[PDB]
Homo-oligomer: A and B are copies of this chain.
């Protein structure tokens, strides 16, 4: 597996959840966007 998909799922979930709400890091955005790209 190129990217462990679990943390990608989790990061995407939490980032989008906080955005919907209205603590994070740029690397987190990187993991979420690559979660996206893989999906």
Contacts and interface: CB of A to CB of B under 8 A. Distances in A.
A21 interface: no
Chain A residues touching B, range: under 10
A30 interface: yes
A33 interface: yes
A12 interface: no
Contact of A26 (B26, B34, B37): B26
A29 interface: yes
Interface in A1-24: none
Interface of A: 26, 29-30, 33-34, 37
Please name the 3 residue pairs, one residue from A and one from B, whose CB atoms are nearest each other, closest first.
A30-B33, A26-B26, A26-B29
